[PDB]
Design a protein around this ligand. Structure first.
Ligand SMILES: *[C@@H]1O[C@H](CO)[C@@H](O[C@@H]2O[C@H](CO)[C@@H](O)[C@H](O)[C@H]2NC(C)=O)[C@H](O)[C@H]1NC(C)=O
Lengths: 40, 49
């Protein structure tokens, strides 16, 4: 959904359709995002 | 009775349920098309004499 705001969550309503169902069945207990990529 | 359905099933949707948990619309596994389901006609028979 296109949103002009980039600093605050917008106001409205939209439903998310599924994209894929992965039949894996692990522990996921913790997760981390992968950003694009400290002396000086 | 199977009939061509004008319902726009989303790509991930296959079945169409009614209030009674009955499928009133299905998607054919072979051809990706949606068919309405309507039960065969029924009713009481009254004998006038
Ligand atoms: C999923 O993996 C986690 C690994 O953390 C397991 O969690 C441990 O499960 C045992 C159960 O006997 C606990 O004694 C541990 O305290 C749990 N570890 C942590 C860090 O919480 C788990 O067994 C696996 N299955 C389930 C249902 O969680």
């Amino acid at each position: 959904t296109p949103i002009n705001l980039v600093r605050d969550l917008p106001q409205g309503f939209s439903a998310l359709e599924p994209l894929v169902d992965l039949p894996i069945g692990i522990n996921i207990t913790r997760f981390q995002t992968l950003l694009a990529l400290s002396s000086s | 009775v199977l009939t061509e359905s004008n319902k726009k099933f989303l790509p991930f949707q296959q079945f169409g349920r009614d209030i009674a948990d009955t499928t009133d619309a299905v998607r054919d596994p072979q051809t990706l098309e949606i068919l309405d389901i309507t039960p065969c006609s029924f009713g009481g028979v009254s004998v006038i004499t």
